[PDB]
Design a binder for this molecule. Structure first.
Ligand SMILES: CCCCCCCCCCCCCCC(=O)OC(COC(=O)CCCCCCCCCCCC(C)C)COC(=O)CCCCCCCCCCCC(C)C
Ligand code: HEC
Ligand code: HEC
Ligand code: HEC
Ligand code: HEC
Ligand code: HEC
Ligand code: HEC
Ligand SMILES: CCCCCCCc1cc(O)c2ccccc2[n+]1[O-]
Ligand code: SF4
Ligand code: SF4
Ligand code: SF4
Ligand code: F3S
Lengths: 164, 55, 342, 164, 951
């Protein structure tokens, strides 16, 4: 909440691999200390970050959104096919501590894989946390599905799309 | 466990800086010492037209 | 016999869950609501097996309890301790023997019989179908539903005779379970074993009549394969051992009936071995050929399910009557009416 | 309750590992290696140094798509501190003591493109052995591809033309 | 209780520069088999090697690799690789070792260097050979003395006999129409195997537009992949190949001995001699490394007079540093050890105590020296015997270089820092040359700078080839007088013991490799064990088993009876036979090899170890004590006597013949040229009486008319049976290694199996039919219909979707699968405790738990990755429709096939290579009467027989 709604850091500054690979990047202590070499140094809540980058020990964050390892989510195709972060992760720009907005159910995944037109967005409003869908949204969702070539629910509901 | 309600930001944000910079990067205008603005999608076209030194 | 049916279905309902490989996910075969939106396929025969085994166990237990409710009333009336009155009282539900209640009881028993006959034929047809819907050359055989019905009735009356005879000779039931009862049960054994012999002839005819090399090699593998002991012992135990059952003296003889019933049970286990294991051993591609050698653990599980069946049977003969108290006094009344009608 | 293949024995992208000394299954780059068909012979493409001095040139001619990519990467990685217009006014400099360099001053107006590539790749002066020292610009070699760094430098030239 | 545990995540402290997190990254490295490196594209998922692919820019790679290079991942991630420096078994320090070594060499610097020696393998590394030359110039009384058990000493001596100088003979099989192999197993891994197999299969692949094919003749004792892919095969004894080459030379007109042979052998001789002298410059005669130097020089003379020099055979400068007789050098070294003239002994690799012939008594000769130095990546038998054992870095974590079979000097590029530390041989020689704690990267960079330049080094590191290190072609002068002035040794009477490298363990280095031990061997399908491979006639005549072996000879009238008699001849395999060869007893169980030569026994080298890892600790029975330095590949007289005590020898097939079924379809070349559909026409005419089958189904299937439909086409004409596709599938798809007991129970886990089939008109010498069988991904799948929970369903693309998260056992998919390609996890087969195996697992493929079914998925990790990449490119370009190219998806089996038998592509795209191969008339699917419509179709084997021999 501070680092986005106040500081204004873009989501790709820290999650650099989200539009290129399946794995959104958990940031490095180098990325944190890029700004925190000057801001709020000698502070006990940044003491762990200062304890890292001197040794090779990382910061053991806890995975809030943990998929059970047979699921194989891909961030790059979802971001590039006009699905914003807010529709699937929530308003993380206002989260002080990140929570799971919804359970990552197979049925909840197949809901958007079978009706993507309720959730697709201009591919240029994906990183915008201030974007809201319009009053109708169904006509432009069908238009964006046809524009981006989004596959039918048979193709998107195939088992080896996700599982492997 | 209900959906948490974080406290709203009650101070200065990056939005004022971003909006001021995007206003200064459009609709031409004057600086305090220089001559005139050239907006985005115009100065990039002038850079493309005039080229850059190579090697 | 219905108690034996319930305990045999209890022993055989664990076997899907036991063999399942991930035993705790037997409920994924059941159509249940989940957060995935997944369904069972319902085109496979194992989903039909889920529905058939659940329906068979439930309707068999329901019909057995319905047939027990005035026996529960008789035990509640005949009990001595006041606290075992309520054990059968809450299971009889105050039956009262009312003639208005007897009309609805007889109609419900008639409709339950006329629903349970196609139920049990459909259950054993579906258990035939979980081989017969496959493309396996020993399993893609279309006479399997009546063949499995006949084999099940054959093995069932073998076990029924093998458990009536000690019950008849150890309890005072010679007046109720008679030599005519043993004679007609052996007659139904002979008839259904003849239908199973006809099914063997149908399979042999299909193998000889087909120009198919896989049917020809199925017959060759059964006759002269590494597991041909099962087929030859099957032929001895289901064809040679039933020709004495045509004879009236052998049909009336008790130790001959016990020996024949045990031989038929062994040969029916050999029949199911011949159907499953020999057909799965040698398949279309000869590179994918191997021998099935059972270990000590599935034999131990077989002995253990025998023990579970006999534990449930001994508990049943301890706390419940072995034979129906009513419908045998009604049988006595019917025989008295027949004697009065001459 | 199930817990079968939810957390598998295979190592995921940022999965921790007790096998290695730094407690991380993700391994760093071997010093002195390059991937397949990724050539490093163009020294001007990967650093701004040719003969020990600045060059003020570009390895490839400028393109409108390249300038748009440079604008995007500037807005992701560089506009957090230096600002969108490049005047050095931002919430990072307001909250802390960053005070980044204005691109529209004389020193950065007559600054070489090779110097821009060097300051993106490496940063500024490190800790001096005499009277202390610190790094502020901190370098962005690990996060940005060098072609995108050259595109960022081209957008810096575009912003300098914009504010002049 | 919650749905999952906490699942901590661990990012970097400093991000890598050229790495995007989640994108697998490919590095061009080099892997060596017998010192001859091949270029490999090893995939680094997150800074660690996981899959080895082929380097298409590399001469001996061409995109395809062999099984050893494919299993180098698990060889790297073996948990029993050495971790610390061992002075006398106790852990020590590399710095303290270098201090002691410097003290020992400065004590040996009082003399000129007589006490210090060396013992390496076959060295093709230019930097390492330059360091050896520097050490030999520093100490002029020191000697090199290199040795490896599978070497080309006979090839070197044959080149020295024929030309008077050392040359490297490379063969161009793309310009060869007649190939003659005199025990030349060139379609097995070795020098130039992938290039030879690729060129041979490119000439072998036949279409409607094809007008020519190559013909292969082999003489051998042990049938191999080369004899499998041969139109004609003659099983002579391995010591009779010299007389065969002499008779071939005499009938061709050059100097040779007119030997007397069997009528079949002289018919095969005149067939070869008539096929030769008709393709001048379009033929090749190849001699094996096991063959004598007289055979090598005689093949050189035949190729010189036949006009093959500069057209199919090529003579280059020698690429293996200093060519020498390695077994004679080992004899000289153990003679010096017995004399006591050696003080300092340094070894790199090799495992000399285990790998030496037993007549030299290497352990007893080594126990007399004061100090020893060893470096072989493991605490081997030699390292346990030696003082001062140092761990050696794997090639996937070591800096170095290696020349190919034609000379490339390709850089060995590490993909990770070493897991256990350990020093390379360049680092060991740098410490030997007075430079301790030197970096191997700095050593190879110092060698390659000022030779190819910094820009050449960067180009070579980005690629996998230095362009200026190819061996130049030379014109050596043939010495026919020295060829004629030879004893020409005759075959000896008695039972001969042929020594052969193992197809899976090679010389025994891969003994702890779980993939290679679990892998079924070619021509025998054995796992986890060694056997005395012999013909059934030899087994009857030696052990006195109660059979006839003349009941295997007949025709199609009694073909099924002969197959039943071969099944009766089976099972006896495992009988332990006491073989007294030359003062030594092995007592090894036998295995029937129907293609094998009479009165010969082959024992695979590389078994019977004692100081290997937990995997393969005591597998097999050792052959190296039986092996002698005088005849390291052949034998003269062996007392092979049956001694009861039947051992359990485990095969993955257990039935060896085709039981009258249309699975392996065989045709001839001329009738293929007349009409390419005649194989299927004859099969369906014999089966149904009509040329085409009117197979009718009651199920509609899906459409597949405007969508990406994926299929596979396997060329049976171009499959040798090298199992490289199987090892690649295991490496890519994380297939578990089960025990030998679990294979004996019948529960091997392999998504693709190579089904050898022994079909012929005589089963005591049949034709070998190898065919890869994976999941056909059938459009109407009998595995899919019988799944009660829809764990196996079919794609929109046309793939059967074996979902393991959904699979709940019930084992019925495998009973309704007509090909039995589905493998079930009966127990916890996948390792859960070994961290090295956990690192070896592919992160993008799941690791299967007990109770689930697994089978071939057409590498759907790569299918999904290319589909996601195509869709992402489509929306980045605004095309609104994704197009997947023909080469965009390359599966693991297709990539690591050295021949290109497997091709993967799109069915609905008519310009794709799979659709062009499936438009051929000899394309067919297995068991079409079951209306499955398989997508893995097969191309029928088209033979090219000669009219003088067969027609
Ligand atoms: C391929 C699929 C085939 C479908 C098979 C359908 C068979 C189901 C028959 C159930 C028996 C009810 C007879 C009751 C009764 O005892 O009838 C009395 C007369 O008394 C009455 O008034 C009737 C009482 C209520 C009847 C209502 C039944 C409810 C509907 C059933 C639900 C099924 C679904 C599918 C609608 C006297 O009549 C008799 O006793 C005659 C009984 C005949 C037994 C049939 C034996 C045939 C065995 C072959 C089984 C075939 C397999 C495929 C199941
Ligand atoms: C809904 C379709 C999503 C969108 C859009 C984005 N993410 Fe995502 N995120 C999603 C899932 C289902 C998961 C779990 C994946 C797993 O294997 O556990 C994630 C995970 C992350 C993570 C953790 C690291 C990782 O798994 O990559 C991060 C840091 C993350 N997501 C951030 C993120 C951002 C910033 C996105 C917008 C550009 C974004 N995700 C897109 C679901 C979805
Ligand atoms: C530069 C753009 C930053 C990056 C990258 C990260 N942080 Fe930051 N952080 C930054 C600012 C300007 C502030 C607020 C300063 C103020 O006076 O309000 C913060 C705040 C924090 C804090 C709180 C410290 C405090 O309030 O005393 C923490 C613990 C923190 N940031 C951690 C942190 C980590 C771990 C980062 C890497 C993922 C990180 N920040 C990025 C500036 C920047
Ligand atoms: C660097 C200063 C960041 C920026 C900008 C954003 N996120 Fe982030 N994200 C960051 C860290 C250090 C972590 C792990 C610690 C944590 O609090 O989770 C994350 C994680 C997420 C997650 C949780 C994923 C998971 O671990 O399961 C989500 C959903 C996520 N980030 C989304 C997200 C979005 C949408 C952002 C732009 C508004 C964003 N993050 C910015 C660091 C940084
Ligand atoms: C709506 C907000 C979605 C949810 C929830 C999930 N996915 Fe998705 N997915 C979505 C879109 C718009 C697409 C684009 C594909 C196209 O052709 O337009 C996808 C695609 C995928 C893919 C790509 C595979 C392919 O296209 O062949 C994968 C691997 C994928 N989705 C995974 C995935 C998983 C595992 C999800 C549950 C956590 C999931 N997606 C949810 C939109 C949405
Ligand atoms: C991506 C859009 C998916 C597709 C297509 C399918 N599944 Fe799925 N699967 C997905 C997710 C996000 C999850 C996790 C659900 C959760 O509550 O966390 C799953 C999980 C399953 C499971 C449960 C596994 C278990 O509990 O051990 C099953 C049984 C499963 N998936 C089966 C399944 C099948 C058979 C599918 C093809 C028809 C299938 N899923 C599609 C994501 C996706
Ligand atoms: C905030 C953490 C910054 C970000 C994000 C980037 N830079 Fe920076 N930069 C920063 C500071 C505090 C300074 C001055 C350091 C000093 O000691 O004065 C700089 C410096 C530059 C310069 C000028 C270098 C010089 O004059 O010697 C340039 C041209 C520059 N930075 C550009 C730049 C670009 C292009 C960035 C995106 C990759 C970028 N900076 C990031 C602080 C920060
Ligand atoms: C709740 C009732 C479910 C119990 C029955 C399960 C059905 C079931 C499941 C299986 O996996 C089978 C495999 C082989 C043979 C029969 C099978 N049946 O019947
Ligand atoms: S398909 Fe497999 S066995 Fe056949 S040649 Fe290729 S890698 Fe070898
Ligand atoms: S080959 Fe076997 S596993 Fe594959 S689709 Fe066909 S029946 Fe199923
Ligand atoms: S295509 Fe891939 S998964 Fe299928 S058999 Fe070949 S390597 Fe294995
Ligand atoms: S029948 Fe089905 S439940 Fe699994 S074991 Fe086979 S895919």
């Amino acid at each position: 909440q501070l680092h986005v709604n106040v500081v204004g850091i873009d989501c790709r500054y820290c999650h650099t691999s989200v539009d290129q690979s399946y794995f959104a990047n958990i940031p490095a202590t180098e990325t944190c200390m890029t700004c925190h070499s000057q801001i709020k140094t000698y502070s006990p809540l940044l003491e762990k970050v200062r304890e890292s980058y001197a040794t090779g020990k990382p910061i053991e964050w806890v995975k809030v959104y943990d998929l059970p390892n047979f699921v194989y989510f891909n961030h790059s195709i979802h971001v590039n096919k006009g699905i914003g972060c807010s529709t699937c992760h929530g308003q993380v720009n206002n989260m002080p501590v990140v929570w799971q907005q919804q359970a990552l159910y197979m049925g909840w995944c197949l809901n958007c894989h079978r009706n993507p037109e309720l959730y697709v967005r201009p591919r240029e409003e994906v990183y915008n946390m201030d974007y809201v869908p319009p009053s109708n949204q169904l006509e432009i969702g069908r238009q964006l599905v046809a524009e981006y070539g989004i596959m039918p629910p048979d193709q998107l509901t195939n088992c080896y799309v996700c599982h492997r | 466990p209900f959906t948490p309600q974080p406290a709203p930001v009650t101070g200065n944000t990056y939005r004022t800086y971003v909006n001021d910079a995007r206003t200064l990067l459009n609709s031409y205008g004057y600086t305090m010492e220089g001559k005139v603005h050239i907006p985005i999608d115009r100065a990039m076209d002038l850079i493309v037209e005039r080229g850059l030194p190579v090697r | 016999a219905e108690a034996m049916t319930l305990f045999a279905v209890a022993c055989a309902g664990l076997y899907p869950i036991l063999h399942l490989g991930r035993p705790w996910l037997f409920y994924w075969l059941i159509p249940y609501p989940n957060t995935h939106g997944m369904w069972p396929q319902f085109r496979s025969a194992l989903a039909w097996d889920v529905f058939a085994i659940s329906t068979y166990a439930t309707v068999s237990l329901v019909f057995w309890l319905v047939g027990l409710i005035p026996d529960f009333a008789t035990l509640r009336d005949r009990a001595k301790n006041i606290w075992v009155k309520r054990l059968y009282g809450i299971a009889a539900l105050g039956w009262r023997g009312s003639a208005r209640h007897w009309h609805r009881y007889e109609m419900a028993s008639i409709l339950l019989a006329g629903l349970s006959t196609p139920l049990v034929v459909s259950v054993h047809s579906i258990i035939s179908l979980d081989f017969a819907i496959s493309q396996v050359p020993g399993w893609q055989v279309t006479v399997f539903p009546p063949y499995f019905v006949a084999g099940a009735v054959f093995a069932g009356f073998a076990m029924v005779l093998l458990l009536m005879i000690p019950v008849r000779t150890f309890y005072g039931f010679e007046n109720y379970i008679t030599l005519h009862h043993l004679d007609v049960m052996a007659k139904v054994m002979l008839t259904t074993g003849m239908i199973v012999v006809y099914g063997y002839f149908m399979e042999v005819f299909a193998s000889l009549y087909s120009g198919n090399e896989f049917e020809e090699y199925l017959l060759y593998n059964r006759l002269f394969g590494p597991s041909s002991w099962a087929y030859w012992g099957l032929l001895f135990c289901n064809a040679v051992a039933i020709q004495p059952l045509w004879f009236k003296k052998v049909r009336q003889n008790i130790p001959a009936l016990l020996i024949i019933s045990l031989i038929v049970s062994v040969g029916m286990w050999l029949e199911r071995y011949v159907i499953i294991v020999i057909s799965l051993e040698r398949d279309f591609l000869p590179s994918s050929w191997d021998i099935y050698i059972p270990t000590i653990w599935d034999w131990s599980l077989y002995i253990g399910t025998f023990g579970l069946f006999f534990t449930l049977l001994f508990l049943f003969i301890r706390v419940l009557p072995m034979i129906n108290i009513f419908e045998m006094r009604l049988f006595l009344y019917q025989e008295t009416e027949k004697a009065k009608q001459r | 309750c199930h817990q079968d293949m939810y957390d598998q024995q295979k190592y995921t992208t940022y999965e921790p590992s007790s096998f290695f000394a730094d407690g991380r299954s993700s391994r760093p780059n071997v010093p002195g290696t390059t991937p397949f068909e990724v050539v490093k012979t163009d020294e001007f493409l990967y650093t701004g140094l040719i003969d020990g001095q600045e060059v003020d040139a570009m390895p490839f001619p400028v393109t409108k798509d390249l300038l748009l990519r440079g604008q995007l990467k500037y807005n992701i990685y560089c506009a957090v501190c230096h600002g969108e217009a490049g005047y050095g006014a931002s919430m990072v400099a307001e909250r802390g003591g960053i005070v980044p360099a204005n691109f529209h001053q004389q020193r950065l107006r007559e600054a070489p493109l090779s110097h821009f590539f060097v300051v993106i790749t490496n940063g500024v002066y490190r800790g001096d052995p005499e009277n202390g020292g610190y790094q502020s610009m901190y370098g962005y070699a690990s996060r940005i591809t060098p072609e995108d760094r050259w595109a960022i430098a081209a957008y810096i030239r575009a912003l300098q033309l914009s504010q002049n | 209780c919650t749905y999952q545990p906490r699942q901590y995540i661990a990012p970097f402290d400093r991000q890598p520069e050229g790495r995007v997190p989640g994108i697998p990254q490919y590095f061009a490295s080099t892997l060596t088999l017998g010192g001859y490196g091949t270029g490999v594209l090893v995939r680094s998922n997150e800074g660690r090697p996981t899959k080895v692919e082929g380097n298409p820019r590399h001469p001996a790679s061409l995109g395809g690799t062999d099984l050893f290079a494919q299993a180098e991942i698990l060889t790297m991630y073996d948990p029993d690789r050495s971790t610390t420096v061992l002075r006398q078994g106790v852990p020590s320090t590399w710095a303290e070792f270098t201090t002691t070594l410097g003290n020992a060499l400065t004590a040996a610097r009082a003399t000129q260097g007589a006490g210090v020696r060396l013992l390496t393998t076959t060295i093709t590394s230019p930097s390492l050979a330059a360091q050896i030359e520097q050490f030999l110039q520093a100490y002029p009384q020191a000697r090199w003395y290199q040795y490896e058990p599978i070497n080309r000493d006979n090839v070197v001596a044959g080149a020295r006999l024929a030309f008077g100088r050392d040359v490297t003979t490379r063969y161009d099989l793309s310009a060869a129409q007649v190939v003659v192999s005199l025990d030349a197993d060139f379609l097995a891994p070795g020098p130039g195997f992938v290039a030879y197999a690729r060129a041979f299969a490119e000439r072998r692949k036949v279409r409607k537009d094809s007008t020519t094919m190559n013909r292969l003749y082999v003489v051998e004792a042990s049938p191999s992949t080369t004899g499998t892919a041969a139109d004609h095969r003659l099983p002579l004894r391995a010591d009779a190949i010299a007389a065969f080459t002499g008779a071939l030379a005499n009938e061709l007109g050059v100097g040779g001995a007119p030997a007397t042979l069997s009528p079949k052998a002289e018919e095969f001789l005149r067939a070869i001699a008539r096929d030769l002298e008709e393709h001048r410059g379009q033929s090749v005669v190849i001699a094996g490394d096991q063959q004598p130097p007289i055979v090598h020089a005689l093949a050189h003379l035949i190729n010189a007079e036949l006009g093959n020099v500069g057209q199919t055979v090529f003579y280059h400068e020698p690429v293996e540093a200093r060519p020498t007789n390695q077994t004679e050098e080992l004899v000289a070294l153990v003679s010096e050890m017995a004399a006591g003239r050696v003080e300092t002994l340094i070894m790199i690799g090799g495992n000399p105590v285990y790998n030496a012939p037993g007549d030299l008594r290497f352990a007893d000769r080594m126990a007399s020296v004061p100090l020893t130095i060893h470096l072989s990546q493991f605490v081997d038998e030699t390292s346990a015997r030696a003082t001062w054992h140092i761990p050696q870095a794997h090639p996937l974590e070591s800096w170095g270089d290696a020349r190919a079979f034609d000379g490339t000097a390709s850089i060995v590029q590490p993909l990770i820092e070493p897991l256990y530390g350990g020093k390379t041989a360049n680092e060991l020689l740098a410490a030997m040359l007075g430079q301790p704690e030197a970096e191997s990267y700095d050593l190879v960079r110092s060698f390659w700078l000022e030779q190819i330049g910094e820009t050449g080094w960067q180009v070579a590191l980005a690629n996998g080839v230095i362009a200026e290190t190819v061996a130049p072609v030379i014109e050596p002068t043939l010495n026919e007088g020295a060829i004629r002035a030879t004893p020409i040794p005759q075959p000896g009477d008695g039972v001969e013991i042929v020594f052969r490298p193992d197809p899976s363990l090679f010389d025994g280095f891969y003994a702890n490799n779980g993939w290679l031990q679990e892998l079924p061997r070619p021509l025998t399908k054995l796992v986890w064990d060694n056997a005395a491979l012999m013909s059934p006639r030899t087994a009857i005549k030696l052990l006195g088993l109660p059979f006839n072996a003349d009941r295997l000879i007949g025709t199609e009238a009694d073909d099924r009876e002969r197959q039943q008699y071969l099944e009766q001849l089976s099972k006896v395999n495992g009988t332990i036979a006491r073989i007294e060869y030359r003062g030594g007893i092995i007592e090894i169980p036998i295995w029937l090899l129907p293609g094998h030569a009479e009165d010969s026994i082959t024992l695979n080298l590389g078994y019977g170890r004692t100081h290997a890892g937990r995997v393969g600790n005591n597998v097999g029975i050792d052959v190296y004590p039986i092996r002698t330095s005088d005849s390291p590949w052949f034998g003269a007289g062996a007392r092979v006597t049956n001694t009861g005590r039947t051992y359990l020898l485990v095969s993955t097939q257990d039935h060896w013949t085709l039981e009258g079924r249309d699975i392996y379809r065989v045709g001839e070349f001329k009738k293929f040229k007349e009409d390419p559909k005649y194989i299927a026409k004859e099969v369906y005419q014999e089966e149904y009486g009509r040329e085409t089958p009117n197979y009718q189904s009651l199920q509609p299937g899906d459409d597949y008319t405007g969508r990406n439909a994926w299929g596979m086409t396997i060329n049976l004409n171009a499959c040798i049976g090298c199992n490289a596709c199987v090892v690649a599938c295991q490496a890519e798809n994380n297939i578990a290694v089960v025990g030998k007991d679990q294979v004996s129970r019948g529960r091997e886990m392999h998504w693709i199996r190579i089904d050898r089939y022994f079909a012929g008109e005589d089963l005591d010498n049949p034709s070998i039919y190898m065919m890869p069988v994976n999941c056909m991904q059938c459009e109407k799948a009998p595995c899919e219909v019988v799944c009660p929970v829809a764990a196996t369903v079919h794609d929109y693309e046309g793939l059967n979707n074996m979902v393991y998260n959904r699979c709940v056992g019930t084992k019925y998919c495998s009973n309704n699968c007509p090909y039995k390609v589905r493998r079930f996890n009966f127990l916890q087969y996948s390792d859960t405790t070994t961290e090295t195996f956990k690192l070896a697992f592919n992160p993008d493929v799941t690791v299967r738990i007990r109770g689930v079914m697994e089978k071939c998925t057409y590498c759907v990790q790569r299918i999904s990755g290319a589909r996601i990449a195509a869709k992402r490119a489509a929306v980045q370009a605004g095309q609104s429709s994704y197009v997947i190219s023909d080469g965009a998806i390359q599966t693991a089996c297709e990539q690591a096939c050295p021949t290109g038998a497997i091709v993967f592509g799109d069915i609905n795209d008519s310009n794709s290579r799979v659709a062009k191969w499936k438009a051929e008339g000899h394309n067919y699917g297995l068991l079409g009467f079951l209306n499955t419509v398989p997508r893995t179709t097969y191309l029928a084997r088209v033979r090219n027989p000669s009219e003088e021999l067969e027609k």
